[PDB]
């Protein structure tokens, strides 16, 4: 089995979102041990109990801000002291907003760009230090977005940040190959979530459906394949790429 | 198992190359039935026997020119009459040469471009008609090359044809979605093969190795994961993309 | 004046089209000499007179098929014997159609792909030999289309050939640089011309307008700048690129 | 003359660099008025006198940090109060460094990413408000780098920020079309300047020269054509693009 991730430790940021939950559950279901973090601890204790109960894998929870480097480092040290080495980092931290181009302020910018671009970078740096010390030839997966190359209205800093992370992915792959660490991205299209429930089920968003070739928004399960590929031996010869999962959304006329 | 291909029928063009053999053996090992074709049938006979004996799957062989539309059409008819419907087409036919930009002629151009771009298009058209006829929601995988976006010297018609195929993959993904058929590409880097042993093991090619981030040419095994992804349920939400498998070669420092 | 093209010889294939007429008139206006070819000599005679009369530059006409290498070569030899050396090749031969993906046949494929991709390649080879023989460091400009990276319905072989020509432009730049020849592309969006008046004035085309950021189809004049840039000293440090002229069409949400 | 910029006001950030001086002189030479800023007012005065003396155009200088949003805003208000309206914003702000991937710290990141990406975004926002207030249909030009899509070692945050700026250019193009403002980028390759004498004039860098198809580093003059195209009427039908000026470097094998 080339997609085997059993007994690995998967570190997942942005773990309290619907996507964060799905990812953790996917890897626990495949027999991987899970390290989940988010800003607020209470949402993770819940996910933790469920995962331990359903799958019996090891689960570690950490509350921290992904932009707090010393917090991430302190998380890794805490893991190292318990004898744990991270195999795969999944950078899934992400915030956005909807504002006209001229209405975004410096505060909006710092929040969106630091969360979507700076934080994955910091986290990758620290996890890589940790992997290198343990001589572990792991993997890094960046959750980007089709908005890293496609555009939409009202989401300018998000687009900027995603595009930055996509190119950073390529550069990281080039600079980290010497440590045997591959670095790749997965770019989802529009996923049906509650943060954009009003938007998608509306009539204006329903017209989007008719532009998307599969006539369907992205389901979490659509991500399963690429996630397992990029986190396992199956993906070891692959580095520096971005896999779009969008039902052809980005290729539409 | 979301990567399940058991009992599917996989159609593989260009099956007589080392890569084609590898692909055939990969899907057979995963319990899938195999349809292989190439120009010379005799080049397929060992593989058929190995596969029947070792994996116990169905194997159909066909001799044809990938540029012969009626031959492809006749093959598909023959499969239908045996109750066989193709689940996945893997377009893996590919030729090249090495010539200065100005030394390539009309004959070279027609050979390289018709084989690399026109034939996969013909096969896709015919396989799609066959799938539709059987009301089947299948998959198409185009083997391109990192040369669909990167350049090299002495391979201009190959680069043009691969970029052509890459964009056609995207266009087909859009136009075929209505039939439940997803269309994707795999772009290998330089694979350690025997048609290019001299190029790769030489001085000019050994300098190439140090440019590649992993400092390894592409192994056939590197392709297994993407192939299984794009041929199975795991990949159903994915259409119109090209997965590069190159150890970072195309990202390498300018 | 870095955009100077006075006294150059500009070779324009596809000269009988609306765009071809426009390009010819553009360069004549700038004091450049004009070599135009198309299949039917009579459509070029009107253009020839119009140009000779208004601008007083040299005009050479050739009736020939652009897919005929021997004809193209004889045209050049003919020019060489008169002491004329081409400075700029503008590859503007291009035909298309509108058919469902499964309705395009082998004949459609050959006409479309040979004219849009094979011919500019043949002409480029022949023009380059002509330049090399005269020890001349000229330019090649391939007219592609935004459909070289974007998609639309019913134009599958056109898209393939344009994407092919786009990458071919990059490869040619690399391979012809040693002869001092730069190679670039201009990719127009949907041009308000007479060859696609029905598509654009239809309702499927009116829905296009509100999607395009400038709310305008492309005017021929929008190409003037890129044409003069890539044909003059102004463009000498530029090779291997494709300039999109489309009012943001390829970036639209 | 479709490239006319006579009497326009061109706003140039990063004006104290070698490139900034060149851009100021280019536009002054073409009869356009110049608004230049840099951190230290003293570095701008030499240029100011030279331009006022040689071309006799209006020159306005401002000391500011391009990351200081309120200072940029005050500059524009100051200009508004004098009856001046900016026609073209040229974002020419850019800093970098050389460090292995894991050696870059939070302070480096902030300096590089805020200067290369956040600042042009702030300036663009402020300048658009200024244009809209004056009902003026101008242009924005972002100086990116071929490193917005290509990679190199030791420059990871620069790559991120430039890729960020590249996609932001496309997004802004879409969102600002409604105001008659086009947004484009110029991506130079490696420029032979005095600020980078060691990497380039040495032999370690000389192996790159053999990689570049033209065998030439980028000269400032190579940018002249694209700059005038994108700042004038010649470029009005163009929005959302990046013009690479690199002698085919990014296309190299």
Author numbering:
A (entry chain B), C (entry chain D), D (entry chain A): 2 to 254
B (entry chain C): 2 to 255
Sentences from the paper on this structure:
The enzyme crystallized in the apo form, with no cofactor or substrate bound in any subunit. All eight chains can be completely traced from residues 2 to 254 (a total chain length of 255 residues). All eight chains align closely, with an r.m.s.d. of 0.3–0.5 Å (Cα atoms). In solution, the native mass determined for SDR-WM99c was consistent with a stable tetramer, and no dimeric population was evident in elution traces. The αβα core is extended in the case of SDR-WM99c by a capping helix–turn–helix feature (helices α′ and α′′; Asn197–Ile213). Helices α′ and α′′ display relatively high B factors (ranging from 146 to 203 Å2), indicating dynamic mobility in this region. Overlay of SDR-WM99c and its closely related SDR structures immediately reveals retention of the geometry of side chains for this catalytic tetrad. These four active-site residues are thereby identified in SDR-WM99c as Asn117 (α4), Ser146 (β5–α6 loop), Tyr159 (α5) and Lys163 (α5). No density consistent with either cofactor or substrate was evident within this structure of SDR-WM99c; however, overlay with the structure of the related FabG1–NADP complex clearly reveals the cofactor site. By direct analogy, in SDR-WM99c the adenine ring and the ribose phosphate are proposed to engage α4 helix residues (Asp66 and Val67) and β1–α1 loop residues (Thr14, Gly15 and Ser17), respectively. In SDR-WM99c, such a cleft appears to be located between helices α′ and α′′, i.e. in a markedly flexible region of the apoenzyme structure.
